[PDB]
Amino acid sequence: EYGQTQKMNLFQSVTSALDNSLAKDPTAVIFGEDVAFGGVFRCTVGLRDKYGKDRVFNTPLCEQGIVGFGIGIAVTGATAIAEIQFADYIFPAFDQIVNEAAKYRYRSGDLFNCGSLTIRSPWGCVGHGALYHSQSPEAFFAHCPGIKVVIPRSPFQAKGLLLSCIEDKNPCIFFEPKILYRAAAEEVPIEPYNIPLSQAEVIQEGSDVTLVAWGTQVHVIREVASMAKEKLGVSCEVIDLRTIIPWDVDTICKSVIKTGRLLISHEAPLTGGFASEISSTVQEECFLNLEAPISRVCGYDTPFPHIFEPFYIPDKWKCYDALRKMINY
Amino acid sequence: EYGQTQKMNLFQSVTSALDNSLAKDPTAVIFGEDVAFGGVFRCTVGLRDKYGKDRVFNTPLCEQGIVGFGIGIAVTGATAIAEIQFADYIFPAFDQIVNEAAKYRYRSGDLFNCGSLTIRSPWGCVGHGALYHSQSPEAFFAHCPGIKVVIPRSPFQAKGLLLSCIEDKNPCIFFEPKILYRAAAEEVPIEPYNIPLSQAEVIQEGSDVTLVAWGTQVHVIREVASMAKEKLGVSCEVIDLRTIIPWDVDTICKSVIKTGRLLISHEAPLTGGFASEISSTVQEECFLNLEAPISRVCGYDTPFPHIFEPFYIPDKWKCYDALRKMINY
Amino acid sequence: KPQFPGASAEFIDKLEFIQPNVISGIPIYRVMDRQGQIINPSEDPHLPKEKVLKLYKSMTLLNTMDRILYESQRQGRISFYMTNYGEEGTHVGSAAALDNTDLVFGQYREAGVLMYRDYPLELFMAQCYGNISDLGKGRQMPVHYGCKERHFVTISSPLATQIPQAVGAAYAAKRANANRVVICYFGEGAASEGDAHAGFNFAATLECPIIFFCRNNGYAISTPTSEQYRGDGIAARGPGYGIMSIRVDGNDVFAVYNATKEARRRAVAENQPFLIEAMTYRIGHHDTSDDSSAYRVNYWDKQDHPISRLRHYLLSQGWWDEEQEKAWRKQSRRKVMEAFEQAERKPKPNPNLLFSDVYQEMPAQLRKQQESLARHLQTYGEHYPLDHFDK
Amino acid sequence: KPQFPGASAEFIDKLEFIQPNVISGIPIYRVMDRQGQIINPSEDPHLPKEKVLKLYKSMTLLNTMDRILYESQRQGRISFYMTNYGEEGTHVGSAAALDNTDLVFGQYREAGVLMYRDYPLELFMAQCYGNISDLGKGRQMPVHYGCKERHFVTISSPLATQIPQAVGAAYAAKRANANRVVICYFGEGAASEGDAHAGFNFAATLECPIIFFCRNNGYAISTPTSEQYRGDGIAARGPGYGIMSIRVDGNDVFAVYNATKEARRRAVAENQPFLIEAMTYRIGHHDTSDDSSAYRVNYWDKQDHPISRLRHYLLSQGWWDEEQEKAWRKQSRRKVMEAFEQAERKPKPNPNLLFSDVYQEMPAQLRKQQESLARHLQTYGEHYPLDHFDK
Ligand SMILES: Cc1ncc(C[n+]2csc(CCOP(=O)(O)OP(=O)(O)O)c2C)c(N)n1
Ligand SMILES: Cc1ncc(C[n+]2csc(CCOP(=O)(O)OP(=O)(O)O)c2C)c(N)n1
Ligand SMILES: [Cl-]
Ligand SMILES: [Cl-]
Ligand SMILES: [K+]
Ligand SMILES: [K+]
Ligand SMILES: [K+]
Ligand SMILES: [K+]
Ligand SMILES: [Mn+2]
Ligand SMILES: [Mn+2]
């Protein structure tokens, strides 16, 4: 399909995406904290040697500066790939993201833009990250018209989505599930390829219930589908959302019209989480097809704990138990 | 009920709340940009003369500093009432609010807290505020366990809710609908009184449909109830949510079990707006009672425009038209 | 000899705190006195007559426009305004020292830069009225100007956000071998923001061809500088970031011009940032929502004004007189009123434009919202001010 | 004479940019040389024997604990650790100069302050293990220590957020007439954050009794200071905010002590902030996720170390010898291992504690989530590590 592949884990697939970008786009630069030596998760290894210190470089330790700086680069039309070291530390930049980057094109009547900005940041739980190296901030950004928010589930997905973000003419936040950085490898094309934004992927067809998730949680619901099939004889349609905003309403609604049941799951806390937007929209569009209430199996409404992580996360047992009750409603 | 009253508009009711606070709590201080001369919306007029320059004072022009400073004051147990000049400018402080204030008690095992912090800020549309003096940021904060978010609809409501926020042992954000600051006055008790947080108010009983809103939008849905009664012979139950988080699930669900229909409205954009959390929760708890899909009549998913404001807002006609379709579903 | 990587310094064997010099701070560079007389001939830029008349006519035309639009706001003809009274010399002195294609970031008080760059009166007006001629499509509050043709990045209300952006644009310019500078204007209040510390530091460490231009006019709305900082203004901050810094008399167009011209020459040649703090006084209210008499002017207006000072210089050269002054005052009033009248009579943009440019393309769900408004207006249109808007 | 409200300064009639002095920066205050010899007798604090032995035993006990817990992390016994190698003198020199009730804000590299304040080994351990003895209830990653009894505000991972907080606590102390200071520690990397600019400025304008203590150890993870700033370190920033500033040899416990003792005396008496930049070197890796050989140590460790320097001073006084050194090394190892073993064997807290303290009270909807977990564990408990947790 896409030419020669090689086995890559998720960090390697990110490096590949970035390499392909710098090779084909002479304007492109990569910057942030500790990116020059290869990054704290290895995502930029080799790139400074290959492309030059003016193109892959460290900034001072200042997230609001990193994002404001990126926006400025993008204002001149040059591709700006900013790194925020953990998604938990994106908040100092929230004003630059929400008040500036998202609104730049609209407020100027398209006289100026920062479409060539991409912000990439490690995301999601990691077993022992506690409050500040575990967060999933996507719902915070979902309430901001003018930015795109994109989350891959695998190395092949990560490279194609990140290439799309870098090339998309809108400021994009790309969240990389850090627990996958060195998890299992899969085959990833060496040359550039794109996966479309705002497009969900049905990864397993099913007829009794629709399951929706993104990031690492996709692998959880895939396992839940298997458990449901084996233990309940229930056929689950498993969907990776991929883009948080603008999201693929049509693919989700089509599935729920078919199955009549929907369970959405994410690591982020329940209240104000992105499952709420999907549930309310599906309810509006698929009301007459709903056999049971839409279920949300999410993180609890607490900060993300250190020692209690195994009890906090919406794991396969929590998802399975919710599904069992919904099938029985 | 509450002793002597006098006619007050919403800014005056805020001043009254603040005055009552400083009088009875010697630790309390009020600070922010331009508060010393009385504030850009007059909310602190007279207080510096009455209570002293050490208690009502201007800070440098730095929102992240204002909030970090407030948290520090609160860490010592002193009451800290911070002002952010417009809600639109709360974003520089988002990290201090979300990563620090909200998590302070939890992460320390209750060895430290900032419960005595309140952040008050003008909020919502004002006819010509455009992108940066119109915003309604409550959904951004609703996804953050550990803070309370509170929005009054009138002067009497504003004073009782603000007193509750100031006295509540958790960091609170109190959003003051600025278009109401000099709108009509109502009777407000001169002495202190409290209205409970996390408690919705049914302001008009009804049997056919539940309408939920907060802030100025409460007055919109009240008018919509009147229009529905007159034009459709439809009885609407009108509910002011008041506290965004933790929200009064029970009062809302009780109403929807009775009526079987729910329309939620807010100025904030639809996607990721707080209507999504209410709709999805009501759907889960009241599924069997729902005669029609829950309707959300919100701002469009754009930045808030200058010249187009009359076309942007979820006004009584937009709400009425939604209600008409829902009644007919 | 100390070995620490973090600083280059000798040891000292006695405890001595370093004290800030705030009482006699960084001195204020002046070229002409309050009577328009050149103080030090070696510093005179000897700008040609046509250029100096341009500085003068730019300032006065801005002032004429300010007077009219401030009145328009008071009558509720436009929703909001911010004047430039006292910022006219900082504006036009610095703009005249830039190359035409140097990129400008600012905020609320930089309209003179656009005026010097020949931005049409019609377009200043179109933005304040949000009419069909506004390239900003009526989306932002008045005075939020922008011009891609004149390299003037659209203003936004959140203070200081442009500072780290300007640094990024400067980094990109360096890479592009643009031989271009970026200039970034901001007030002394805005300098308190975290983003100011971000931009100053990044510009130094990333070696960017940028001029930081701080207008220190003594107040941020009601807040005097005594409550804004306790160091020696903003200029004294620059050296702590490794930035070459200077303070100038902001009511002296020539001092402003000289310092900007030299900052621009060195910033581009050396790829290093320069900070200019221009000392002025905000003569007008903060904006149209402000009655500044609540917290504080005639001294500055009659004793030390950029327009009056330049006018005195012009007289000494034989380059202006009372007749020319009268005629220009009349011509400039006529030009502003012609643009004003035309602006007021133009329709506003189609309400459909509330939905475009949120993203480059319009997402299907957004188009769905646009269609819902069209349907809504079909039924309930009588309740909307449609007669004012383009169709 | 200039009249501008924004600064106090004379005019100057010649254009001169102000150049930063970075090559010979603010000098580094030293009291003892690398051989533990007092350089300038008038600067000798002449601390009594018992106090100086406390400085020494605090440093070495920390170092012993570091070695063990770093190993524990490598074995996966604890999830994370950050060492203090080279920060021991900055820690204990400054802590010894504070009053017991002075409030401390920090981050990751301040454990010596707690050690000096007699924080139990059992509690350092309980936090790293997240066990039932941890007053933090196992909620934060290791080394995120806090102690209300010892006035040491709980550490949080986001850099610099404590800086404006510390200023607020200092303002409150002033009002309370506490006669207390607040000290606020942070690294040179963290000083780049917007919150550092917020805290420094507020402390000056609001006149707060605070000591800002910056540990400049040459690196922020992989980033050398050449990429972090271009001014003369952090100390040169203080005067620009109006803050009295000093730079000290961070490997010299006496220089650290003298500067902190004087900063504390003047901050409380005058209600004004003081900035101390302590020059050190981060000898260890940044944390347990870091292999620092990827981007850069033996010089500092064998040629200029706070523990070695103090040890030399002790020998010269006749206050220590090889036998005492051996015995203490043994006793301190025994004490750390006893706490370590006890910590590893304690259960973790009840999983119910994941829900409390989010708010002071627990909202009904939160209690509902707690009940849902209890039901869940009733059915699926075999799939959870319940045998390790309190019930
Ligand atoms: C982040 C943010 N906070 C507050 C405001 C409200 N505000 C608008 S102008 C202003 C004062 C700015 O003062 P200064 O930077 O000195 O500029 P000047 O108006 O004196 O020219 C303030 C506080 C804002 N626009 N942005
Ligand atoms: C806001 C934020 N950004 C990034 C990080 C990741 N991080 C943890 S420590 C560190 C380096 C801090 O360096 P410095 O302040 O010099 O302290 P040191 O580790 O040298 O003692 C970084 C970038 C963080 N914790 N917080
Ligand atoms: Cl503003
Ligand atoms: Cl960290
Ligand atoms: K992009
Ligand atoms: K409170
Ligand atoms: K701006
Ligand atoms: K911190
Ligand atoms: Mn100002
Ligand atoms: Mn460091």
Short mmCIF file of C-alpha atoms in Angstrom, two decimals, chain A residues 33-37 40 48 58-64 85 88-89 92 128-133 270-271 299-308 310-313 315 317-321 324-325, chain D residues 79 108 128-130 137-142 156-159 189-190 192-194 220-223 227-228 294-295 348-351 353-355 358 366 369 372-373 376-377 380 383-386 389:
data_model
loop_
_atom_site.label_atom_id
_atom_site.label_comp_id
_atom_site.label_asym_id
_atom_site.label_seq_id
_atom_site.Cartn_x
_atom_site.Cartn_y
_atom_site.Cartn_z
CA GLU A 33 12.49 21.92 26.02
CA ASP A 34 15.31 19.36 25.59
CA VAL A 35 14.54 18.55 21.97
CA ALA A 36 18.12 19.14 20.75
CA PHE A 37 19.69 15.99 22.34
CA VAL A 40 13.13 13.14 27.08
CA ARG A 48 19.53 18.11 14.93
CA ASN A 58 16.03 23.99 22.62
CA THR A 59 14.05 26.89 24.03
CA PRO A 60 14.13 28.38 27.51
CA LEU A 61 11.89 26.60 30.03
CA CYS A 62 8.67 28.53 29.34
CA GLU A 63 5.56 26.96 27.86
CA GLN A 64 3.74 30.25 27.20
CA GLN A 85 7.24 18.18 27.31
CA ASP A 88 0.12 18.27 31.94
CA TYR A 89 2.39 21.32 31.30
CA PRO A 92 0.77 27.85 30.96
CA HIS A 128 3.01 5.87 38.01
CA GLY A 129 2.82 9.42 36.50
CA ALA A 130 0.49 10.71 39.25
CA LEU A 131 -1.06 14.17 38.97
CA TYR A 132 1.34 15.84 36.52
CA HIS A 133 2.72 13.22 34.13
CA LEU A 270 -16.12 12.01 33.56
CA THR A 271 -17.44 15.52 34.25
CA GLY A 299 -11.68 8.38 34.92
CA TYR A 300 -13.22 9.47 38.26
CA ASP A 301 -13.69 13.21 38.96
CA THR A 302 -10.43 13.51 40.91
CA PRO A 303 -6.81 14.54 40.11
CA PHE A 304 -4.83 11.59 38.72
CA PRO A 305 -3.35 9.66 41.72
CA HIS A 306 0.06 8.05 42.15
CA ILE A 307 -0.43 4.85 44.26
CA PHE A 308 -4.15 4.42 43.34
CA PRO A 310 -4.80 0.72 39.10
CA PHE A 311 -8.11 1.69 40.77
CA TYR A 312 -8.60 5.00 38.94
CA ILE A 313 -8.41 4.00 35.26
CA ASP A 315 -10.00 -0.51 32.55
CA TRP A 317 -13.30 -4.76 33.69
CA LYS A 318 -14.96 -1.42 34.32
CA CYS A 319 -15.83 -1.13 30.62
CA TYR A 320 -17.00 -4.76 30.45
CA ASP A 321 -19.20 -4.37 33.54
CA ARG A 324 -22.97 -6.00 30.56
CA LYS A 325 -25.44 -3.73 32.35
CA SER D 79 8.66 4.55 40.80
CA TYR D 108 12.44 18.80 43.76
CA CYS D 128 8.32 7.74 48.17
CA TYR D 129 6.50 4.43 48.80
CA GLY D 130 3.02 5.98 48.99
CA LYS D 137 -2.04 9.65 51.29
CA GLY D 138 0.15 8.24 48.45
CA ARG D 139 -1.38 10.65 45.94
CA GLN D 140 1.76 12.33 44.49
CA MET D 141 4.84 10.93 42.73
CA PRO D 142 7.91 10.30 44.97
CA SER D 156 4.20 20.15 43.05
CA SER D 157 5.62 19.07 39.66
CA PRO D 158 4.71 22.19 37.57
CA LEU D 159 7.83 24.37 37.63
CA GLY D 189 15.52 26.62 34.35
CA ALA D 190 12.31 27.30 36.40
CA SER D 192 12.53 31.17 32.69
CA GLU D 193 8.84 30.54 33.47
CA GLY D 194 6.29 33.42 33.31
CA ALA D 220 17.84 22.17 33.27
CA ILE D 221 17.65 18.47 32.34
CA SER D 222 19.73 18.50 29.07
CA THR D 223 19.66 22.26 28.58
CA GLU D 227 20.39 28.02 25.99
CA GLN D 228 18.43 29.11 29.08
CA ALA D 294 23.74 11.75 26.83
CA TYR D 295 24.42 15.55 27.00
CA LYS D 348 -0.60 1.22 50.88
CA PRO D 349 -3.59 3.38 51.95
CA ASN D 350 -7.19 2.32 51.48
CA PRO D 351 -8.22 2.83 47.75
CA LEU D 353 -8.61 7.65 49.77
CA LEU D 354 -8.44 8.26 46.00
CA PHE D 355 -11.73 10.20 46.40
CA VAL D 358 -10.69 16.67 46.08
CA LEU D 366 -18.15 12.01 43.91
CA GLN D 369 -18.22 7.28 42.15
CA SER D 372 -19.29 2.46 42.26
CA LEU D 373 -15.65 1.49 42.86
CA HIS D 376 -16.80 -2.93 41.32
CA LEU D 377 -14.18 -4.36 43.68
CA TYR D 380 -13.94 -7.99 40.09
CA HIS D 383 -8.20 -8.53 39.17
CA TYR D 384 -6.79 -5.77 41.41
CA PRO D 385 -3.72 -5.68 43.67
CA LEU D 386 -5.91 -5.56 46.82
CA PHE D 389 -3.74 -2.00 50.21
#
